[PDB]
Design a protein around this ligand. Structure first.
Ligand SMILES: [Mg+2]
Ligand SMILES: [Mg+2]
Ligand SMILES: [Mg+2]
Ligand SMILES: [Mg+2]
Ligand SMILES: [Mg+2]
Ligand SMILES: [Mg+2]
Ligand SMILES: [Mg+2]
Ligand SMILES: [Mg+2]
Ligand SMILES: [Mg+2]
Ligand SMILES: [Mg+2]
Ligand SMILES: [Mg+2]
Ligand SMILES: [Mg+2]
Ligand SMILES: [Mg+2]
Ligand SMILES: [Mg+2]
Ligand SMILES: [Mg+2]
Ligand SMILES: [Mg+2]
Ligand SMILES: [Mg+2]
Ligand SMILES: [Mg+2]
Ligand SMILES: [Mg+2]
Ligand SMILES: [Mg+2]
Ligand SMILES: [Mg+2]
Ligand SMILES: [Mg+2]
Ligand SMILES: [Mg+2]
Ligand SMILES: [Mg+2]
Ligand SMILES: [Mg+2]
Ligand SMILES: [Mg+2]
Ligand SMILES: [Mg+2]
Ligand SMILES: [Mg+2]
Ligand SMILES: [Mg+2]
Ligand SMILES: [Mg+2]
Ligand SMILES: [Mg+2]
Ligand SMILES: [Mg+2]
Ligand SMILES: [Mg+2]
Ligand SMILES: [Mg+2]
Ligand SMILES: [Mg+2]
Ligand SMILES: [Mg+2]
Ligand SMILES: [Mg+2]
Ligand SMILES: [Mg+2]
Ligand SMILES: [Mg+2]
Ligand SMILES: [Mg+2]
Ligand SMILES: [Mg+2]
Ligand SMILES: [Mg+2]
Ligand SMILES: [Mg+2]
Ligand SMILES: [Mg+2]
Ligand SMILES: [Mg+2]
Ligand SMILES: [Mg+2]
Ligand SMILES: [Mg+2]
Ligand SMILES: [Mg+2]
Ligand SMILES: [Mg+2]
Lengths: 178, 259, 143, 67, 60
RNA sequence: AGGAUAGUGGCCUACCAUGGUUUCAACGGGUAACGGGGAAUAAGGGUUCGAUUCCGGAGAGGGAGCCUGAGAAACGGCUACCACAUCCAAGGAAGGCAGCAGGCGCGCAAAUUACCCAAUCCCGACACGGGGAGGUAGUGACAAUAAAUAACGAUACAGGGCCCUUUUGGGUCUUGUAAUUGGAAUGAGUACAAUGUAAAUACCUUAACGAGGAACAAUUGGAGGGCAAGUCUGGUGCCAGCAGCCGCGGUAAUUCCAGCUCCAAAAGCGUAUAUUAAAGUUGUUGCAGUUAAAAAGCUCGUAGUUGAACCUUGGGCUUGGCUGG
């Protein structure tokens, strides 16, 4: 038959289901970033858990090792590219020091609220889901869309949105049309 | 298994074709021909996947049935014909001549050549022996049989085929200092000069090759193809890159500067 | 010297000794002896269907005092007879003689649970309808 | 939107090197009318039971049924 | 062990439990909104009794 | 030595020797055993699985024997036997779904008797025919990805936050309550249509329609401990039942049956079984053996395992490539 298509899981659940310290930390963290559920917190922790594993293997190698230099610089460059890692912390030791709030800062939902286009973080998600926000000339309706540094300046209302120069929406047309 | 296989699973095809996983269940099975199955390139892959002249397998058959495609100066209509190393592909409708030479990345490069260079080819001598009525002959890497060769020509040498009469113009003896491209193994596509030939009776002889950057690698004698009489003097035009293998860090640095 | 060989060429002794001593692990014995395949009423399966033979009721163990309401079921796959508990308040009234019931273990993996003596299975479905659906009046028994 | 396009040197060249379904899309050809695949396959297998011409086969089959 | 007993009392308590209908209460918010409701309830308007914090205080 | 084979060969025959394997486990038995690439879990070391997208092997109900052909001991080829089994005018004849779809049976356990060669490829005398190979759709909560179920105001009313200030009384800006009040936004759905396709469906775009209880109404398990969240109310009263384990139930039951409230995960959640970590409870890393389980009654002893030290060191001369600075 046809070749199999690869797929993989993008999250992992905690080993201890009930722990007040972790439950309170998650809810405090979900409330700050307007997340739908706990799985969106597990997803960040999962990809951060494997970022640490990759960094540990390179850190055990000698400095100036060809694999450590190539993949370490590439991983740092990618993290700098999405704005998670600062430009003055490209040392692979500050990579281990990264925290989940660094990743939630770079979500589309966080940037819409922090750019003043929305009153609150929960307004940001519905604006995104309702096809109002465009990055560049492309409409993006995924709240977890990770904003790159060069894409940061191009976040604004979609050109065909009621808030961004488009026509009036469904509700207004029904009222003003009577 | 009761007989020869006639299918080729997509996953079981040679990796240097660079076929995608999800385009179908099967891959083009190369026909029997001058080149081995694992070391060939079917014309359907070349005309559709490489040049992208044809959009699908129906179109490559339409191209070849109008007599456009010539391999080694003869019109070929077999869509799965196993073209291989040093073969010449002529498309006089587009006025293009190609030679199948490996690039340094291990794949068959899209190597355009002049019409003057497309008038001959090189073949590695596999064996020299006597035929019926005591007539010596040479077998090249593409299955060619040339009678009455120069009596100095021996195995592992390279001959220059007139490619229109099939005769030998001249040859290169296998010896230290000859220009070489590697045609097998993980050093496939690299170009260098012979430094030292290490003999092993009953086993596999090993050849030490020095890159233009004074990088040394070892490969089996069966993967050695003599292409020039000395360094910097190849008998055919080399593909872009001149067969010098760069490390990934060097490639990343070169790509950064180019862009 | 810790009572086991340490020489670099004593791998056979180490491999055979470990192989001999894993037989002391009862969990290991059941996997290789195939006891679930040979001895378990389900034959190693998670579930098994059967026919209800009779409603009887089992007295609980001390210090508890109650009537655990079970049924006698004959398994279709091998004809063996087992006792299966009928969970929840009043679900025995959903189970009649000569009904087809789907069984499952009690979750203790071959041992009896709690004060219920000698019962290792529970009723999951009757007449192809979930016992929980009948209990919560989500569905009605087809009869 | 993004797609793919072909421009031939002439309409005659286009009609030669084009799939049938695209010419039907453009009105340059008529959709060929054939029976379903089940009917074509069943007819092929029915004809497999006849050796020789159909005229001979049906006349001989007719002769057997004296009715 | 000895196993037997009268089957007449099956479902005794559940049968005689007085049926009480659920009051038609407002729907709770779903999805992201429910996480928003819980976050404020636990970190914005804290209802602690001077170090005594209860999620479900019974009326007392 | 011969015969046979495409060919080596006890492959077989004639004659002749008595050899061949084995405690470094032969031979035999079992396998809920096709092998591998690989899968699950994983600090390391490991444990468990691999019928199944690729490769190799084997088979076409069970055997056996063959024809054609380069290639088959082929089975959508034949011959014969065994077991099933079809039509019959009773003389005879015809079978092989572990191919696609489908049916019976089996079961805890698995979908349509659909469309097409347009793509991927294969076959043929071949640019043209054929292909249940293959592709498309149907069923599909096997698994996997992203991700709705509301957002924002305005007032009311409260508190904090500040400021006019001594407090007083206010102005006033951040939260919480509002059966207490609005206007905005959108896709689920549907739909002209275009795109998509061999033709369609669906997706993606997109006119018009499409949200206040926005009934376009989120569920599954729990609330004594483990383990997060009730000593609330009613019912029962060692009964019914719960309860993985410890335990709960004999009239205010924190555990049953319910209502309210609350907790956990959420388009998913629970249960059963297997397996992995936890398990340093299989221990090579890395267990224990006086008394918790465990030194053979004691010596000898073959295989196995393991076995004291010792043989060009030091010095000197030049010598390249790199790393402080
Ligand atoms: Mg909590
Ligand atoms: Mg050849
Ligand atoms: Mg040739
Ligand atoms: Mg085990
Ligand atoms: Mg007890
Ligand atoms: Mg049943
Ligand atoms: Mg015919
Ligand atoms: Mg015919
Ligand atoms: Mg002989
Ligand atoms: Mg022989
Ligand atoms: Mg088997
Ligand atoms: Mg196995
Ligand atoms: Mg471990
Ligand atoms: Mg496998
Ligand atoms: Mg396998
Ligand atoms: Mg099996
Ligand atoms: Mg599978
Ligand atoms: Mg296979
Ligand atoms: Mg076979
Ligand atoms: Mg069968
Ligand atoms: Mg077959
Ligand atoms: Mg056979
Ligand atoms: Mg068949
Ligand atoms: Mg079938
Ligand atoms: Mg199923
Ligand atoms: Mg079915
Ligand atoms: Mg598809
Ligand atoms: Mg809903
Ligand atoms: Mg619709
Ligand atoms: Mg529609
Ligand atoms: Mg159309
Ligand atoms: Mg509930
Ligand atoms: Mg309760
Ligand atoms: Mg607690
Ligand atoms: Mg417990
Ligand atoms: Mg009372
Ligand atoms: Mg009471
Ligand atoms: Mg009470
Ligand atoms: Mg309590
Ligand atoms: Mg409880
Ligand atoms: Mg939750
Ligand atoms: Mg461990
Ligand atoms: Mg144990
Ligand atoms: Mg101990
Ligand atoms: Mg121990
Ligand atoms: Mg004792
Ligand atoms: Mg003693
Ligand atoms: Mg002894
Ligand atoms: Mg020694």
């Amino acid at each position: 038959p046809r070749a199999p298509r690869t797929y993989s899981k993008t999250y992992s659940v905690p080993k201890r289901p009930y722990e007040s310290a972790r439950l309170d930390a998650e809810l405090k963290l979900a409330g700050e970033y307007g997340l739908k559920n706990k799985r969106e917190i597990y997803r960040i922790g999962f990809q951060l858990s494997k970022i640490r594993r990759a960094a540990r293997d390179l850190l055990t190698r000698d400095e100036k090792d060809p694999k450590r230099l190539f993949e370490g610089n590439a991983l740092i460059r990618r993290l700098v590219r999405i704005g998670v890692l600062s430009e003055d912390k490209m040392k692979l030791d500050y990579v281990l020091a990264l925290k989940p709030e660094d990743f939630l800062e770079r979500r589309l939902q966080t940037q819409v609220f922090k750019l003043g286009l929305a009153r609150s973080i929960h307004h940001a998600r519905v604006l995104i889901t309702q096809r109002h926000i465009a990055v560049g000339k492309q409409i993006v309706n995924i709240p977890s869309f990770t904003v790159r540094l060069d894409s940061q300046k191009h976040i604004d209302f979609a050109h065909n949105s009621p808030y961004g120069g488009g026509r009036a929406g469904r509700v207004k047309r029904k009222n003003q049309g009577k | 298994a009761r007989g020869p296989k006639k299918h080729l699973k997509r996953l079981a095809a040679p990796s240097h074709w660079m076929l995608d996983k999800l385009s179908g269940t099967y891959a083009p099975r190369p026909s029997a021909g001058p080149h081995k199955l694992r070391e060939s390139l079917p014309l359907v892959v070349f005309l559709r996947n490489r040049l992208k002249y044809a959009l699908n397998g129906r179109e490559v058959k339409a191209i070849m049935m109008q007599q456009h495609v010539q391999v080694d100066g003869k019109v070929r209509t077999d869509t799965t014909y196993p073209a291989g190393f040093m073969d010449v592909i002529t498309l006089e409708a587009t006025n293009e001549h190609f030679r199948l030479v490996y690039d340094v990345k291990g794949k068959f490069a899209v190597h355009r050549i002049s019409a003057e260079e497309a008038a001959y080819k090189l073949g590695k001598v596999k064996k020299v022996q006597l035929g019926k009525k005591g007539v010596p002959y040479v077998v090249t890497h593409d299955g060619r049989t040339i009678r009455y060769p120069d009596p100095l020509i021996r195995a592992n040498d390279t001959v220059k085929i007139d490619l229109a009469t099939g005769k030998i113009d001249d040859f290169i003896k296998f010896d230290t200092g000859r220009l070489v491209m590697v045609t097998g193994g993980r050093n496939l596509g690299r170009v260098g000069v012979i430094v030292h030939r290490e003999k092993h009776e009953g086993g596999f002889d090993l050849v030490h090759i020095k890159d233009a950057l004074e990088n040394t690698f070892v490969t089996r004698l069966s993967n050695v193809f003599v292409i020039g009489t000395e360094a910097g003097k190849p008998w055919v035009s080399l593909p872009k890159g001149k067969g010098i293998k760069l490390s990934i860090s060097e490639e990343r640095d070169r790509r950064r500067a180019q862009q | 010297g810790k009572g086991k060989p340490r020489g670099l060429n004593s791998a056979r002794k180490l491999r055979v000794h470990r192989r001999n001593n894993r037989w002391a692990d009862q969990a290991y014995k059941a996997r290789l002896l195939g006891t679930a395949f040979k001895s378990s009423p389900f034959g190693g399966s998670s579930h098994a269907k059967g026919i209800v033979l009779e409603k009887i009721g089992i007295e609980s163990k001390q210090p508890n005092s109650a009537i655990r309401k079970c049924v006698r079921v004959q398994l279709i796959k091998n004809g063996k007879k087992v006792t299966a508990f009928v969970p929840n308040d009043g679900c025995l009234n959903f189970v009649d003689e000569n009904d087809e019931v789907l069984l499952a273990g009690f979750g203790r993996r071959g041992k009896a649970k709690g004060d219920i003596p000698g019962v290792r299975f529970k009723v999951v479905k009757v007449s192809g309808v979930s016992l929980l659906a009948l209990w919560k009046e989500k569905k009605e028994k087809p009869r | 939107s993004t797609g793919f396009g072909l421009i031939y040197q002439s309409v005659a060249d286009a009609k030669r090197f084009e799939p049938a379904y695209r010419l039907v899309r453009y009105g340059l050809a008529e959709k060929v009318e054939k029976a379903s695949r089940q009917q074509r396959k069943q007819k092929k297998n029915r004809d497999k039971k006849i050796f020789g011409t159909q005229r001979r086969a049906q006349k001989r089959a007719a002769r057997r049924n004296a009715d | 062990g000895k196993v037997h007993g009268s089957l007449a009392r099956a479902g005794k308590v559940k049968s005689q439990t007085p049926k009480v209908e659920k009051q038609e209460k407002p729907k709770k918010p779903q999805g992201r909104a429910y996480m928003r409701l819980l976050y404020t309830r636990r970190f914005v308007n804290v209802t602690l009794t001077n170090g005594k914090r209860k999620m479900n205080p019974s009326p007392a």
